[PDB]
């Protein structure tokens, strides 16, 4: 799924605790609202623990 | 040298050689990811271009 031409809102992503893994490789998630990117992609699949 | 904190000023030379942090997080003076050696060697061949 391709997501673009919208204001990125990661505020609800780190303000929840239902997730188990929030490791961000390459870039630091402490500064995300101040970063400007061109393309944002999101994959989805289900795997065992 | 391949890495320099900022742009160098005219008629200036620098001697210091230490691992150059090139990431959001520092590697704190040991060899690893997001830091490399600014000083790297030349390679030549007798039959090169």
């Amino acid at each position, epitope marked *: 799924k391709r997501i673009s031409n919208c204001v990125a809102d990661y505020s609800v992503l780190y*303000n929840s*605790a239902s997730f*188990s893994t*929030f*490791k961000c490789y390459g870039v*630091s998630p402490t500064k995300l609202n101040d970063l400007c990117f061109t393309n944002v992609y999101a994959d989805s699949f289900v795997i065992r623990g | 040298r391949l890495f320099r904190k900022s742009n160098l000023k005219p008629f200036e030379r620098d001697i210091s050689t230490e691992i150059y942090q090139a990431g959001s*997080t520092p*590697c704190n*003076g040991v060899e690893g990811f997001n830091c490399y050696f600014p000083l790297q060697s030349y390679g030549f061949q007798p039959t090169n271009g």
Partner: antibody
Amino acid sequence: EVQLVESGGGLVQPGGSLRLSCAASGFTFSSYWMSWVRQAPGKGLEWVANIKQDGSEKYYVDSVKGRFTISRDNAKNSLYLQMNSLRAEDTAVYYCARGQLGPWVGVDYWGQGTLVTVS
Amino acid sequence: NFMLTQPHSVSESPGKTVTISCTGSSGSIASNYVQWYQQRPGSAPTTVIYEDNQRPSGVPDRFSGSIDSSSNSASLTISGLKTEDEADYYCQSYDSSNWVFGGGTQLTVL
């Protein structure tokens, strides 16, 4: 600069009720995570509870489950820690912990705390 | 039953680079971020390493952090070994809806 003031202890009570309050200033109280951390005198650190920015979700450890509670408000910028049915293990110093984006980034905030002993 | 195993009395050395190892057993510590904190005895604690590789502003450039996924351990090394106040250090990780603290590593003789 962020100032954290804690004054909720100073008396001994077996199995009673005690209310602790942490005062915070210098930052917005309704956009980060708060938590609470205690440690025994002469022993290691341990975790107590973590609080969302609106108080919708609260969690504690399994050793204190069933008891323990937390409440918050953004109008007065204060945290309320109520206790019930204390034991002898509860001799600890309590710091009101504050987060930045979530509970994976780190704590990085610890008040001076208040001595809390039971007898 | 996530727990972090680390020693209690290391780094008793003058002025060189020594390492402190923090490892877990129930799960992989490389899945979530692991941090390092320092506690002044009789005073408020502070944090030396956050985001598993970064230091806060004002922290000196000497304390190092690294992650080894082969041994499932996290390494904290200090380079300068200056006249810092005696303290103890702890390890933190995240399994599910909970926080886990380390045992503690005393460092008094520098």
